[PDB]
Amino acid sequence: PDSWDKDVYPEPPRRTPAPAPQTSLPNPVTYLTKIFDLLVDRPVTLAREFIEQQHAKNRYYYYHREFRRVPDITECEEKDILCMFEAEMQWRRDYKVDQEIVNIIQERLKACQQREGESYRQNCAKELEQFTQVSKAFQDRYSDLGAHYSARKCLAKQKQRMLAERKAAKEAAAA
Amino acid sequence: WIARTFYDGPEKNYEKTMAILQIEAEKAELRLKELEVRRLMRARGDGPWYQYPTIDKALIDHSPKTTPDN
Numbered sequence: 001p002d003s004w005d006k007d008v009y010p011e012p013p014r015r016t017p018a019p020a021p022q023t024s025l026p027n028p029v030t031y032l033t034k035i036f037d038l039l040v041d042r043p044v045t046l047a048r049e050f051i052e053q054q055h056a057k058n059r060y061y062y063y064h065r066e067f068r069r070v071p072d073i074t075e076c077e078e079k080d081i082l083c084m085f086e087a088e089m090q091w092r093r094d095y096k097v098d099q100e101i102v103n104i105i106q107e108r109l110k111a112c113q114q115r116e117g118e119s120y121r122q123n124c125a126k127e128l129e130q131f132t133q134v135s136k137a138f139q140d141r142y143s144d145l146g147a148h149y150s151a152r153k154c155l156a157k158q159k160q161r162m163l164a165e166r167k168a169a170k171e172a173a174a175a
Numbered sequence: 176w177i178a179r180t181f182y183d184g185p186e187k188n189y190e191k192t193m194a195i196l197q198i199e200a201e202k203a204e205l206r207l208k209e210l211e212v213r214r215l216m217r218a219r220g221d222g223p224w225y226q227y228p229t230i231d232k233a234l235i236d237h238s239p240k241t242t243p244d245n
């Protein structure tokens with residue numbers, strides 16, 4: 001459906017087999033789903049048509065809010081409360097967006113597991129690799145801040161991590 | 176409807192928080208400066224505060240005193 005982007009939430013082309021009745025005996029599934037169609041799907045469809053025309057009579061729009069970029073906690077003086085406030089709000093918004101990204105990837109993984117059925121272990125390596133990469137990055141960003149987290153604590157954690165990385169690289173170079 | 180009739184936009188609370196933070200930070204730095212100024216004035220006594228009285232020199236009598244050597 002157009003209600004969501006197909007690229008963000010991909011699906012395989014959905015190949016389905018064709019009915020191959022090898023016997024002439026009538027299968028009750030076909031007749032029963034036809035009577036279901038007649039007794040259920042049409043009245044629901046007509047009610048939806050009524051509701052959709054009534055909605056089309058009154059059309060109005062809502063907008064997705066755009067947020068400007070502001071200097072982050074690194075370009076903030078040690079006691080300048082206003083810039084720290086701006087940077088903290090921006091960092092919290094980014095944290096929420098990252099959580100939503102991880103949610104999207106997890107939804108992809110769950111859909112793959114259910115869809116591929118008995119061969120999910122092989123036919124879901126792509127989603128597993130994507131989730132592993134995203135999970136590793138998210139953990140590196142936000143794993144251990146705890147309650148009372150902030151942009152300053154995240155910056156300190158990043159500085160410690162990249163100091164360790166610089167030390168390791170220097171040790172490798174001077175090996 | 177609820178948002179229109181009961182609440183306001185994020186700008187109001189955002190900028191009110193900005194103003195509140197600015198006031199509170201100024202008050203904090205003022206308190207610290209005031210404590211340091213009090214410490215300095217009480218230590219040296221060269222300020223307007225902690226001025227303890229000394230004898231007024233207008234009480235001294237500057238006249239011959241029945242004896243040349245005071």
Ligand SMILES: CCCCCCCCCCCCCCCCC[C@@H](O)O[C@H](CO[C@H](O)CCCCCCCCCCCCCCC)COP(=O)(O)OCC[N+](C)(C)C
Nearest residue numbers: 176177178179180181182183184185186187188189190191
């Ligand atoms: C399905 C549709 C209905 C949905 C349900 C809605 C019901 C809402 C009831 C609960 C309301 C919760 C509180 C909401 C009001 C908060 C206080 C204040 O903000 O509201 C003021 C309005 O409050 C109302 O004037 C008073 C509400 C009182 C509700 C009482 C309901 C029960 C009364 C029962 C009496 C029955 C008769 C007596 C029988 C004996 C206007 O706010 P304002 O300061 O502008 O906000 C600034 C931002 N602006 C400018 C954009 C608005």
